[model samples]
Each structure stands twice: as C-alpha cells, then as structure tokens.
Target: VNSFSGYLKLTDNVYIKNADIVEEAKKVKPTVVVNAANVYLKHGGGVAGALNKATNNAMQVESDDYIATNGPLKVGGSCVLSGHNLAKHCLHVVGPNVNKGEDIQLLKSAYENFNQHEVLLAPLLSAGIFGADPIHSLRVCVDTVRTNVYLAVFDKNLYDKLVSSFL
Candidate 1:
C-alpha cells in the first residue's frame, strides 16, 4: 500500500493527507497557504471559500488589494499576500479551465510557479467548478510541487484512488 491511515508520502517533499484543506492548513504550520483561485482572486467557493472563513474575512480584503494593485491574474499566474489569520503567508494561483483543451499543461504551469522555499498546504487546482477531473487534477498535483507540502483530499473515494494510483 502507498498510504497509511489516509496519509501518503509520495516524496520527501510531496506529502498527501485525506482531510479538509483549510483545517490542515490551519492545523499544520505551513510557511504559505496555497489557494486554487480564479483569475479574479475571489474567495467564493472551494478552497477559496474555506480559507476565506478561516482567515477571519481578511482573505477578501487581501484579494481585493491584490487585484487592485496587480489586476486579475491570468491562468497559470501566481501572487503572494499576507496571511490574514491562517498561515504566515498565502499564495493565490490561478488554474486553467479544462475547456482550454491543453489544461494538462496549463494546470501543471500553475504549480510550476510554486516557491520551493515555502512549505505549502494546497488543494487540487481547477478540479471543482473549473472542471478538471479529480483524477487528472490529482495527477497534476502529485507530479508537481517540488518542496515540502501537504496535498489535501476531502473525499474518501478520491483518496482511495490516489492511494491506488501509487500502489
């Protein structure tokens, strides 16, 4: 088996946990919290909504300020901002919409911008409303991320698939 008790270590730097992403981001002290954000940086749903609640509403302001200063980020672009309440910092990265047809490379490009020095707690990018399949999303997440980080998986079915993928 590749996992034990819902925990999997694909590499020394890439760690996986079958749990809520926001809870893990808070429970463990990560250097930076990664968000599977939209081009607008709105903390509305999925990873963004969860972290918005955890950050005591500061996430929205940070997002607003970021956009105000830098404008909307293109898919595969990345930005970093202060952690309102969760972690020391937060990283907002845009995931490509799967409708692009080249989303495999586009999603990978999102993670390619990850800062290796910062430990991360990140969720599957673009897998929810953005329409990337969970399997493909998980594969992209597992293949990227070169530093110490935890990948969050909320559903048991997906977690089992991840474990099985490696086993």
Candidate 2:
C-alpha cells in the first residue's frame, strides 16, 4: 500500500470550486484549508456526547445531523472489533484498530455520493450536514484531481440494505 502524508487546513466554509477533496489532497502539497464540511449532531441521544468524544481536539465544525454511524462503536466509542462493550474494563494503550476492508468500502461510498462538479475552493457555509463521514471528503479530494469526481448520490436505502445483508 502507498502512504501519502500531507496537511489539511480546516477553513470555516467554502467548498472547492470545480476541484474535489481527494484531488486537492493529492495535488495540493500545502495545507488545503477547505471550509468546514457538515458536522451534524443528534440531540437527546448520545450524539452530542459522541461528538464530544470523537472531536477531542474540540474542533467545532458546523454540525448538520446526529445520524448514527454505520459502525457498532458509538460516535465517541473506540473502534475495537470483537471487544466487549458492556463487559469488563478495557486494556492498555495501543494504536486504533479498524477493519481495513470495511473501512475501504466506507471511504469509497463517501466519494461516490458527492456532486463533484459543483466544486468550490471552499465549502458553502450556508448548508447543513448530509450525514456522511469525513473520509468521503478525502475521497472527493483524491478523485477531484483526476476530474473524475462526478458520480451518483449516496443511496441511503441501498446502503442500508447492503449493510443489513452483511450484518
């Protein structure tokens, strides 16, 4: 596998113009300070708490929804597969673990769903969240440079069905 190292500057709003996030990530050597993408929070539930957990840096972006992630670990929860959630206490420190195959698929979806042609140099500040993960933004950045960012909108029902089938 190839590893790419770079910086992404988090601007407030302003999507890239005609350039996807993935393309930006690949081509732009300096920090790509795209504006804040949608950051949603689900109220009444642990959504806010989840946000507090994942965004430990206190990096506040405009949240759009608290839509549950497609993973078992709650928003703030650690991503340790097969680990007992309601059981004994956790173990020592280690690098975050994830299901690589599953993660790759999720990353693919984030890019596949966005409308890449309407690219701006930054995200539009006025819009709300669309209930997707940040990796999709990276996908858009990578796919943008190739000018192949144009693709289908994410099919929630289809995604649900597919996910349920595997679950």
Candidate 3:
C-alpha cells in the first residue's frame, strides 16, 4: 500500500526483502501470493484481510465455497485459488497461533506446504497479530521453504535481519 518496490535478490530466481506483498504481487505477477490465514480461512483481518480486499473481495467468497465442500482448514493447512486481480492465484496457509499456544513446529508445517508454483509471494508466517516472533517464523521458512518465492516484507527490522541471513 505504501511502497511497491526495492526488493533484495536472494538467489537467481528468488527474492527476500522489504516490499508490500500486494504491490509487489502486482509487479512480479507470481503464480500465487501467500496469506497468513486462520483455520476457518476467514478473510477477516491480518494478511488475509489485506489480500481479501486487494482481490476485490472475492477471496472470501471463494474460501466459503471451498470450505463448504471441504470443511474448515486445519492449522498448517492450505488452499489455493484465483488471485482475481493481483497474482494468478492465492495461497492461503493457516499458520500457528502462538498466543493460542502451538509450537513453532506448526509454522514449519505451514512453510513446508508451499509448492508447485514457479514464483510465489510469501510473508513471514505467524509473526504478526497471531504473535510468533518473526525470527522464529523465519527460521521455520529457512528450514522448510522448497519452491521459488519472493519473500516480501514491510517491516524494516525484519528486512534487516533477513539481509543478515544471507551472510
């Protein structure tokens, strides 16, 4: 929303740095944009709400229909669908809610679930309102992320730490 570019390249086909996910999603045009979601997959708040609004409010509708047939998603679970206007599709991942007491292991499970996209956008999992520390969440990603991704970030401090990870 505030800024759209200046991402640091981490590899030949991957990136990780400061950038608004939606803004960059529009630019990079990834196969999917990952959202830190709840188990219900409600497009209510946090990253889910941000993406929900960006996709013209259709993400919630799709999610409701998806759940109607498949039931609620579990923590560390995921679902994918059209991005509507941003990326080609959106990847909804239910990250662990540490405030509710789950261990970081679940966040790792969420990170590992990302696959089958040539390029995707991901934010640090379980590190915002859901309450897991970004460093801990990033650790899980470093351990589990398997596909090409542009790990977008909005926080300066987290971006700084991410830069350090390269060294």
Candidate 4:
C-alpha cells in the first residue's frame, strides 16, 4: 500500500494496479479473494463469471451449494469457497444489483463480512457492470478493510486516476 489521506491511508501490503483481476489474483496468491456475486451464485457475466471460468467453475459449485442450504444471500451476506486456480479460497459476497442504486451500502456490507485474513484480494465492487464510480467504490473498500488489501482495477484510466489521487 501507498501513503494517502486519513481515510485512504493504505498499508504496506495494499496495492492498486491497472491489471487483469484474475492475473493479479494469480500473482498475489492470497489466502482469500473476494468476488462480487449474487444470491444464486450465477456467474453469467461480469467479474464473477470470469472468475468462475478461470477456476473451472468451482466457485459456482460452492456458491450453488451455499444457496441450496443458506437460502438467498442478502445484500451484505457472503460465503467462502475452496480455491482452485491461484487463490486458496474464494470469498463470495452478494453485492446489490447496480440498477437498484444500493452499490455503496452493499459494498460496505460485503466488506464487513471479511474474516480478517492476512492477505486478501478484492475488486472495486459494483464499479463495472454495476456502474459505480471506481474512486468512490475504492474509498468504501479501503475504508472497510483498513489495510493489507489488494485492490484490483481493470481499467487503466481508473488505475491511473487512483494513483494520481493517492500520490
């Protein structure tokens, strides 16, 4: 992590980069990687879909199992799955539908469910298909985790903006 304002104060381990989220996941090899998912564990599109494909659909299987037993995941609800590709585990957090305009609160809820692992990978929740502003969504993610967070960004412009803002 790099130095920044009070709210954006990042730890030595936290990182913001313009790279493929899945590749970053492989590079860091964290204990857990957070995924933006829904109640049904349906990885039809977006980041979740790609992650599922990368992991040979293992993520989808775990999420499906979770939903089968735990019922529909709420805005803040989450589940953990054994990792297959680069991560040891996948932490699936149910983010609110972007169209519903509950992105910020929903992201906060997902972060709150984290178990405080030493190393963690998380995306800018609701920022892509969900249409959330990367910077604002990042603020929520960083503020929620506080430190040791690997924030993955796919957009080069967004990553550059983040760097400029922090620097």
Per-candidate TM-scores read: 0.86, 0.21, 0.87, 0.83
lDDT of 1 by residue, 1-167 (tens): 22223457777667777888777766665678788788888888777888898887888987898789888998898888876667778888888866555455788889876755456777778776677887777767667767666778888788888778763
- Candidate 1 minimal-lDDT segment of 10 residues: 1-10
User: How far out, in Å, is residue 125 in model 1?
Assistant: 1.5
The TM-score-based order of candidates, best leading, equals: 3, 1, 4, 2
For residues 82-166, what per-residue lDDT tens digits would candidate 2 score against the true structure?
1112112111111111321123233333232222323222221111132333344443345433322211112345334322432
lDDT by residue (122-144, candidate 4, tens digit) is 77777778667777776776677
* TM-score comparison, 3 vs 4, better candidate: 3
Error of 2 at 75 (Å): 12
The Cα error of candidate 2 at residue 117, in Å, is 6.1
Q: Which ranges in model 1 have alpha carbons more than 4 Å from their true place?
A: 1-6, 99-102
For model 4, the superposed segments whose C-alpha errors exceed 4 Å read 1-13
Cα TM-score of candidate 3: 0.87
Q: Give candidate 4's error at residue 124 in angstroms.
A: 1.1
TM-score of 2: 0.21
Worst 10 residues of 4 by lDDT: 1-10
